[PDB]
Each structure stands twice: as C-alpha cells, then as structure tokens.
Amino acid sequence: FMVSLPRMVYPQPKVLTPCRKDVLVVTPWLAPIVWEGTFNIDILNEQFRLQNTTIGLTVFAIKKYVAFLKLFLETAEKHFMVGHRVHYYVFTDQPAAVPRVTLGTGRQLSVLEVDVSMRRMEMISDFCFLSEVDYLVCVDVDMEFRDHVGVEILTPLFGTLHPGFYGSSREAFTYERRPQSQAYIPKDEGDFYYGGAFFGGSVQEVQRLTRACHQAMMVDQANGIEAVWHDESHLNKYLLRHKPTKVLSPEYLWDQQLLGWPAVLRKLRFTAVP
Amino acid sequence: FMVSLPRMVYPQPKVLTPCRKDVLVVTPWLAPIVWEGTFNIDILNEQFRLQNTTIGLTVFAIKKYVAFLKLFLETAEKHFMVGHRVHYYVFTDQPAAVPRVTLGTGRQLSVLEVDVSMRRMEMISDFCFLSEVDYLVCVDVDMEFRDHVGVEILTPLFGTLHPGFYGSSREAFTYERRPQSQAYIPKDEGDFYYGGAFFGGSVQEVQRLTRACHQAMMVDQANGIEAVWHDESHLNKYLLRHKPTKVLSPEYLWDQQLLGWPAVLRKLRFTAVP
Ligand SMILES: O=c1ccn([C@@H]2O[C@H](COP(=O)(O)OP(=O)(O)O[C@H]3O[C@H](COCc4ccccc4[N+](=O)O)[C@H](O)[C@H](O)[C@H]3O)[C@@H](O)[C@H]2O)c(=O)[nH]1
Ligand SMILES: O=c1ccn([C@@H]2O[C@H](COP(=O)(O)OP(=O)(O)O[C@H]3O[C@H](COCc4ccccc4[N+](=O)O)[C@H](O)[C@H](O)[C@H]3O)[C@@H](O)[C@H]2O)c(=O)[nH]1
Ligand SMILES: [Mn+2]
Numbered sequence A, B: 001f002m003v004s005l006p007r008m009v010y011p012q013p014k015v016l017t018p019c020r021k022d023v024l025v026v027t028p029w030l031a032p033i034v035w036e037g038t039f040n041i042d043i044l045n046e047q048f049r050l051q052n053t054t055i056g057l058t059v060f061a062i063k064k065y066v067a068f069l070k071l072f073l074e075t076a077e078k079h080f081m082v083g084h085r086v087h088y089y090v091f092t093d094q095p096a097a098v099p100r101v102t103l104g105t106g107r108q109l110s111v112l113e114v115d116v117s118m119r120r121m122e123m124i125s126d127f128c129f130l131s132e133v134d135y136l137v138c139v140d141v142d143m144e145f146r147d148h149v150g151v152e153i154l155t156p157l158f159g160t161l162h163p164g165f166y167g168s169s170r171e172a173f174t175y176e177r178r179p180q181s182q183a184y185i186p187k188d189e190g191d192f193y194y195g196g197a198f199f200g201g202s203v204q205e206v207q208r209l210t211r212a213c214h215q216a217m218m219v220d221q222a223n224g225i226e227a228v229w230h231d232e233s234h235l236n237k238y239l240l241r242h243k244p245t246k247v248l249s250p251e252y253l254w255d256q257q258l259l260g261w262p263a264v265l266r267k268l269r270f271t272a273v274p
C-alpha cells in the first residue's frame, strides 16, 4: 500500500513537446528508455522514499580485480542511490584485500567469500537478498560512477544498452549465432544489445534471470559449446524472450576512452576505468 | 511466473529515431503516454495472452442512458480487447432495457441491478471483480469505439488525457479550486487533466482509487460542498497524489463534433456519440 505524495511544485509536463527529439524514449513494449531529460528525480525520489526502498548492489572482485574496489565504492558513495538505503555485496576470494571505504548513513557493505565472469550468474542466483533488499543491481567492478545513478533505474527487470551497439543494426549485434547454443539469436531477431556489465530488477526477477542463464550455461557446457560473449550472450537471449520493464540508455554504461562524449549523451554516469 | 515469448519477426526498434517527434511519450515519473506509433501490438498481445489476462469493463446505464448501450456494446465487440477474455459489467436500474448483443468467444456480460455520475465510485468500490478479472476499465456509456483499444492500456493504474485540455496550461485546467473541498488543487500544481470518462488498472488499484474518491466525496458532502466536476475532480486529485503507471493520449477519449480530427491524433479510438 502506497500513501499519497505530498504537495510539490515543479514544471508542468508539456504534452505537445517531446522530452527528447534525438532518441527513442520508450520501447515498442512500452518500457521507458531512461535518458537525461525523461525524468524528474524529485518525483521519483519521493515515490521510492515513501516505500522505504532498499537497493542491493552486487559486484565481483576476484583475483587482481580487487584493485578496482576502492574507486568503485568511493564513487558509488558519491553517485549511487544517494539518500536511499543501500547494501553493497562484494563477492571476493580475498576478503582481506577489500578496502576500507567510509559509507554514508543508511548504507552498508557485506563481504561474501567465494569462467569468473560466467560464474557470476550462478553465485548471484544462490545468494538470492530476499530478506534484505527490494531491488538488486548487478554490475562489473572495473568501473566508476561519474554522475547520478538513482531510483529512475528501478523496475521489476532492467537491462542497459551496450555502448558499442546502441546505433547498430541487429545484424551487427554480437549475439551468439550458432544454433547449437542456448544463447542463439537469428539475424532477423533482436530488439537491443544489452550489456552484461549492468542489469537488475526486483530480487524475484533477478533470481529468475540468473537461474535461467545459469541453466542455459550448464546445457551449453554439457553440449561442448561456450557462448561467444559468455554471460552477456545468455543475458541477451533472456531479455529477448522476457522483455525488460525499463531499458537504461548508454549514459549508464559508457567508455569515454573508446567512444568520446557524443552530443546524444547529456551525462556520462557509469563508466569504464581509464 | 511468466513463460518465454516465442520467436517473432518484427522491425528493429531505432534507438536514434524517436517514435513520435510531436508529442510527449513518457511522463516525468517514467509512465508511458500511449499514442499510436509508441507500441507494437503483436508483442503486447503475446505478453498478455501468455498470462491468460481477463479484462472487466464497467459501464453505468441509469435512467435514459440505457439507449446508449446497443452502440456501446456493439462497437466494444469490434474494437475492445479483441482476442482476449472480457467481462462486461452493466450497472443499471432497468435490467429489462439491456439490449441483446452478440458476443465473441471468451466474452461475457453481467447485468448488475442498482448524483448518478458521482455515485459510480461507490458502486465500483463495493463490487470490487477480484475473483473474476485481472484488470478493470471504467468508462462512460455515452460513447462508441471507433478504433483499436487493447492491452496497450493495461497497467496497475491508468488515467486518460481529457480532450479539452491536453494542450492547456495547468492554470486553465478545471480542477476544483476551493480549499474547502477534498478535491482542491492549487494553481501551481497539477501534471495533467484526466478525464472522468475513462480510467482503470488492476482490480486492487481500482478498488483503492474508487474507495479513496468515495471517501473524499462523503467528506465534501458532510462539509456542504460539491466539487465543480464531481467524480472527475476527485479523480484528478487522486491521480495528482498517486501517479498513474500509464497515461492514455486523447486518442482514447475524443469528441470529433467539438474538436475535429487534428494531425496529432493518428487514430480516434473511443469517442463521444453524435
Ligand atoms: O579475473 C577476474 C575476471 C572478471 N572478474 C569480474 O567479472 C567482471 C567481468 O570481467 P571483465 O570486466 O574483465 O570483462 P569485460 O571485457 O568488461 O566484459 C565482457 O567480456 C567478458 C569476457 O571476458 C573477456 C575479457 C577478459 C579479460 C580481458 C579482456 C576481455 N575482453 O573483453 O576481450 C564477458 O563476456 C562479459 O559478459 C562481457 O561484458 C569484472 O568486472 C569483475 O567483476 C573478476 O572479478 N576477476
Ligand atoms: O442519468 C444518467 C446520468 C449519468 N449516467 C452515467 O454517468 C456517466 C456520466 O454522465 P454524462 O456522460 O452525462 O456526463 P459527461 O458530461 O459526459 O461527464 C462529465 O460531467 C459529469 C457531470 O454531469 C454534467 C452533465 C449532465 C448532463 C448533461 C450535461 C452535463 N454537462 O456536461 O454539463 C461529471 O462531472 C463527469 O465526471 C464528467 O466527466 C454516463 O456516461 C453514464 O454512464 C447515467 O447512467 N445516467
Ligand atoms: Mn568490465
């Protein structure tokens, strides 16, 4: 049950002015595509705060990738869900290498001691979080937050547009193209190319996704085949067949070194590390 | 639990081409605004059929308004949720005046025997439908369907843009403006002016809405005040404080006699009767 929003003063939406004229802001299945200029964060923050929302964020730092944690967490503190409850889950083989990072109020971190990229689906599935968070966000650790990433992303199931393919034809998408693999997508199918480095949703939907992809990967293994982009290939197959309820623009998954800063991106929020 | 969609071939969404350049297609709280060109109905039909969705439609035909039923139902048969399960609920004081209209398969009608406009909230609330339908759609009877109205509208809570105000400033919206009324909205607040003639959602959310508006109306009555546009005024207050998850364009609530057929409307779906 959701109580009423309080009185707020903000600009009137303009029905006869599109919010963006340069990009698609809704999918053909009526899921919002989240770009700067599509949302009023004061309204969303109200809505999610009134539900006392807690966001879990999963990150794997195995072997040498522990060196990415300090910047990742420090920048998360600055830009990820600020003002809401957050629970970081750091999956690692070196609990002692986890850096000591100061957290804001309402924010906590748990260290969970544990090919590597692929096995994430399995591990996320097993830890499905049900009692502790409302949403789960699953990301790569070799990244930093450079701008706002907040409750605008939250929804039962979301994927993110891979920054190498948001302008590409589906023929050019690097989907798994061998029929022998459970991740197989034909050249005449596909909505988008979603990035393996940033997906999420409610705990229930994320558990479902990660279970499905793990099961698919096991079948492929039993069949002596490995998907061309591993977890990302299976993620893409899952999201083709189970459409996400929100799609994040490449603002939320970017590499400025390789791609610069095009006019279509008003903000670069979550980026590869230089 | 939602099973996988089957393989389908349809045009690729174009991330760098907006679907509409003349209208706002998403609210600032990231609810889709449903216009022609925003949705692929084959994808939505798949999604809703896989859930065996049943849609209830409520309509009140009290006193002389029984004469509107024949056209209303005949045109609903042609254009409303065709291919899905539908349950019409006709609220009337003259069960014998309900015309005999031939229904397609999967479609049924119930006659429920019962100021008039206002009391709808109360009656809808009491009949909340929970065992028989997944969604409820609540409309005026003095209307006809002239084009597709389908599962693209379905969501936990929706309102429809009143056709007299979709281009107007919020100052010009005919909200209740007296602080004494529970429907009061100040001149600096308001997103949209929603029509009383077409709203809906899941049963739970509709029961909540109709209960809230009924309660508000009773308080106003006890206080010796009646909202300027009655149920519609209270609907608008409720939807200001509880944002809808989808907003229907005026394609879904139109009067061609009074407003013609502007270029911004590609389809006129649900219209006033000439
Ligand atoms: O020793 C590890 C390893 C991973 N992780 C964890 O796994 C995440 C993903 O790994 P990456 O970030 O490395 O992957 P991305 O390329 O960003 O990611 C891409 O390429 C991958 C294959 O490797 C392809 C690949 C491997 C090495 C070098 C270049 C590569 N390449 O691209 O051609 C997969 O196909 C991914 O799905 C895809 O998105 C890290 O952020 C850590 O959290 C650890 O903790 N510890
Ligand atoms: O004897 C009835 C009555 C209603 N209903 C049922 O109630 C519905 C709404 O009534 P209407 O469709 O009449 O209302 P709308 O104007 O479309 O509707 C507007 O004006 C209304 C006030 O009346 C204002 C009003 C009343 C009379 C004439 C002109 C009016 N006017 O606009 O200035 C309310 O303010 C509405 O919320 C508003 O949308 C009908 O479709 C029937 O289902 C019956 O079954 N049997
Ligand atoms: Mn990476």
Ligand SMILES: [Mn+2]
Residues within 6 Å of the ligand: B140, B141, B142, B197
């Ligand atoms: Mn009417």
